[PDB]
Scaffold this active site. Sequence first.
Site, PDB file in Angstrom:
ATOM      1  N   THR A 220       0.902  -1.045   0.111  1.00  0.00           N
ATOM      2  CA  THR A 220      -0.029   0.137  -0.081  1.00  0.00           C
ATOM      3  C   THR A 220       0.850   1.158   0.169  1.00  0.00           C
ATOM      4  OG1 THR A 220      -1.578  -1.106   1.112  1.00  0.00           O
ATOM      5  CG2 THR A 220      -1.985   1.473   1.051  1.00  0.00           C
TER       6      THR A 220
ATOM      7  N   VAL B 131       0.489   4.208  -2.705  1.00  0.00           N
ATOM      8  CA  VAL B 131       0.315   5.369  -2.341  1.00  0.00           C
ATOM      9  C   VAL B 131       1.539   6.373  -2.960  1.00  0.00           C
ATOM     10  CG1 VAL B 131       0.767   7.212  -0.345  1.00  0.00           C
ATOM     11  CG2 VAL B 131      -0.935   4.981  -0.322  1.00  0.00           C
TER      12      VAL B 131
ATOM     13  N   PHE C 217       3.757   1.619  -1.126  1.00  0.00           N
ATOM     14  CA  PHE C 217       4.358   1.971  -2.523  1.00  0.00           C
ATOM     15  C   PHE C 217       3.371   2.312  -3.486  1.00  0.00           C
ATOM     16  CE2 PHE C 217       8.126  -0.874  -1.053  1.00  0.00           C
ATOM     17  CZ  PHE C 217       9.205   0.251  -1.033  1.00  0.00           C
TER      18      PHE C 217
ATOM     19  N   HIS D  20      -7.901  -0.659  -1.290  1.00  0.00           N
ATOM     20  CA  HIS D  20      -6.596  -1.351  -1.953  1.00  0.00           C
ATOM     21  C   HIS D  20      -7.573  -2.617  -2.252  1.00  0.00           C
ATOM     22  CE1 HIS D  20      -1.904  -2.348  -2.281  1.00  0.00           C
ATOM     23  NE2 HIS D  20      -2.883  -3.056  -3.283  1.00  0.00           N
TER      24      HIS D  20
ATOM     25  N   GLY E  84       2.357  15.942  -0.115  1.00  0.00           N
ATOM     26  CA  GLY E  84       1.270  15.223  -0.012  1.00  0.00           C
ATOM     27  C   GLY E  84       0.407  15.712   1.530  1.00  0.00           C
TER      28      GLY E  84
ATOM     29  N   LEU F  79       3.320   5.767  -5.544  1.00  0.00           N
ATOM     30  CA  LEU F  79       2.980   5.738  -7.048  1.00  0.00           C
ATOM     31  C   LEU F  79       1.857   6.636  -7.576  1.00  0.00           C
ATOM     32  CD1 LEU F  79       3.842   4.521  -9.850  1.00  0.00           C
ATOM     33  CD2 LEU F  79       2.390   2.772  -9.471  1.00  0.00           C
ATOM     34  N   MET F  80       0.925   6.914  -6.635  1.00  0.00           N
ATOM     35  CA  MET F  80      -0.090   7.636  -6.960  1.00  0.00           C
ATOM     36  C   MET F  80       0.189   9.251  -6.695  1.00  0.00           C
ATOM     37  SD  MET F  80      -3.215   5.541  -5.119  1.00  0.00           S
ATOM     38  CE  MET F  80      -4.351   4.645  -6.263  1.00  0.00           C
ATOM     39  N   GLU F  81       1.151   9.263  -5.928  1.00  0.00           N
ATOM     40  CA  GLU F  81       1.540  10.645  -5.488  1.00  0.00           C
ATOM     41  C   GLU F  81       2.648  11.147  -6.697  1.00  0.00           C
ATOM     42  OE1 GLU F  81       3.343  11.991  -1.898  1.00  0.00           O
ATOM     43  OE2 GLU F  81       2.252  10.196  -0.592  1.00  0.00           O
TER      44      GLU F  81
END
EC number: 3.1.2.29
Lengths: 133, 133
Positions: free
Chosen positions: B38, B42, B40, B72, B65, B44-46
Site C-alpha cells: 500500500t 500511495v 508503495f 486497496h 502530499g 506511485l499515486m503521489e
Amino acid sequence: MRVGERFTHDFVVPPHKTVRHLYPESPEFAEFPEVFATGFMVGLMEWACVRAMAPYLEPGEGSLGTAICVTHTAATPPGLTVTVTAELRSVEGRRLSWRVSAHDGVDEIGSGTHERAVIHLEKFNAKVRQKTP
Amino acid sequence: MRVGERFTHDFVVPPHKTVRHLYPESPEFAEFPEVFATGFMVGLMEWACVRAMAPYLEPGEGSLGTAICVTHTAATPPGLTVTVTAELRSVEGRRLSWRVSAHDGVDEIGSGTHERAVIHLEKFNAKVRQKTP
C-alpha cells in the site's frame, strides 16, 4: 481482541525514509525536501496494526491492508521519534478497522483510519501467483 | 491548471516493491506475501500527481502530499503494469485535490483521493530545520 484496545509503537526516523527513498527510480522525487514520506508513514501505521493483531491470528493466517484514510499535516526530518497509536474500532468477520494516529514529538503528523483483511496465506498466495506473468 | 485534467502514469512493478521492502527493519513483515505494498501504491499515486502538476509550478515552488484516502482492493505480484489515473478534482489556491485510481492490467487495485499543497521550498525547508535534531 477487544474493540477500544490501543497499541503504540515508536520509530526513530532514519535518513533513508524520505520521499526520494520510497522511489529511488523517480527523477521527479530526486530533489524533494528530506522529510518522512507519506508512503513510509502509511507502512509504519500498518506495521503497528499488524503487531497488535499478531497474538490473535491462527497459524497459516496473516493480513493485508485493504483501505487507508489519513492526513499528513506536519513534516518530519530524520532523527525525530514518530509514535504511532493504533486503536481497534471494529472486528467484522475477517475485517478489522483501526484508528491510526502519529506524532513526531513536536507535532501531530497525521491521523485517520486503516482497514485490514485476515487472509489464509497458502490460499491467497496460490491465487495471486495465477495472475503472475 | 484545469479541473477534470487527467494524467496516466504506467509502472512495471519490480520485485523490490513488496511489503518486506517498504520496511526491511521489520521482522513482523518478513514473511508477508510478495505483493505491491500500500505504501508503495500511495507513493506511485503521489508520483502521478506530482508529474501532472509540475508544468504549473513557479520557480522555487514544490509540493507535499497532505492526505491520501484510498482502498486497496486487489493484489499485485511483481511483473504486472500498474496504470495510475490522476484526475484533478479541485484547485483552490495552494490546494489540489485529485481522484486517483490504479489497475494492474488484470484488476482495479485501488481508488480514492489524494491532496497536495504547493509550498515555497526555501521557506518550507527553513521550517524543517528549526525542528531537525
